């Protein structure tokens, strides 16, 4: 899988 973060933030995948 490509990297993600389960933490919700104003913009994701930065």
């Amino acid at each position: 899988e490509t990297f993600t973060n389960k933490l919700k933030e104003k913009h994701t995948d930065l």
Epitope: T4, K10, H11, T12, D13, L14
Partner: antibody
Framework: EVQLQQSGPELVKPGASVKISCKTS????????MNWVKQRPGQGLEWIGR????????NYNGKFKDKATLTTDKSSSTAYMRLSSLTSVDSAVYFC???????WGQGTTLTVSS | DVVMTQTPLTLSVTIGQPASISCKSS???????????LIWLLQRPGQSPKRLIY???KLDSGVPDRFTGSGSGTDFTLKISRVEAEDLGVYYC?????????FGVGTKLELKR
């Protein structure tokens, strides 16, 4: 790799509704915002709104709030956009786009016509 | 809403020459979290947009080094150090700081030969 795969083209009559899908693969779907964007000649690219699949939080452009409804099915890693009360000005190509517009679907062409 | 004003509207350029596009926003794109949510996208005809630059100056994976992004506040530039034939298309700036998120009108890049 991240893949966003949209549903096929649609021809719908004025006053009707349509639901377009964006099936995702290659990342954990619940962890990235999904946006929807309109592209029409002359109007350019317009952001419709977004949904966070992890909790169903949505943000809409006020221009589209009475027209668009965004949902997700986590079980199939798919995002959906319903557009209602359609008129000719809704004819356009619609895109799903992840996160800060980092990956885009191939587009779905909608034509509103009798 | 935040208006994104791009210039020029058309870029007519020869291979190897440098080129640039500027984007003005009607409100500062600096967010209270310290980030500036400004990106640049390229769309070729009949294709979807692809992101090239994000957070003003960061290059997306697989984007040639010939592309750089700079700026702050309300004023931003996309620079191409030497245009290649495959750079053709329509470039858009877009902002994700203020709701609703908005796009510039697009700059078409065409090649001379």
């Amino acid at each position: 790799e991240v893949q966003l795969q949209q549903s096929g083209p649609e021809l719908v009559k004025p006053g009707a509704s349509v639901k377009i899908s964006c099936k995702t693969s290659g990342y954990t779907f619940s962890n990235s915002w999904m946006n929807w964007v309109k592209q029409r000649p002359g109007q350019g690219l317009e952001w419709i709104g977004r949904i966070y699949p992890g909790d169903g939080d949505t943000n809409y452009n006020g221009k589209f709030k009475d027209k668009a409804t965004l949902t997700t099915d986590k079980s199939s890693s798919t995002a959906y956009m319903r557009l209602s009360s359609l008129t000719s000005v809704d004819s356009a190509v619609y895109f799903c786009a992840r996160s800060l517009f980092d990956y885009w679907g191939q587009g779905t062409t909608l034509t509103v016509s009798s | 809403d935040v208006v994104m004003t791009q210039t020029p509207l058309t870029l007519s350029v020869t291979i190897g020459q440098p080129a640039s596009i500027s984007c003005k926003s009607s409100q500062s794109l600096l967010d209270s979290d310290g980030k500036t949510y400004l990106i640049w996208l390229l769309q070729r005809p009949g294709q979807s947009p692809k992101r090239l630059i994000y957070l003003v100056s960061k290059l997306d994976s697989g984007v040639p080094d010939r592309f750089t992004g700079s700026g702050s506040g309300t004023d931003f530039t996309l620079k191409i150090s030497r245009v290649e034939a495959e750079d053709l298309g329509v470039y858009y700036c877009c902002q994700g700081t203020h709701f609703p998120f908005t796009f510039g009108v697009g700059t078409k890049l065409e090649l001379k030969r």
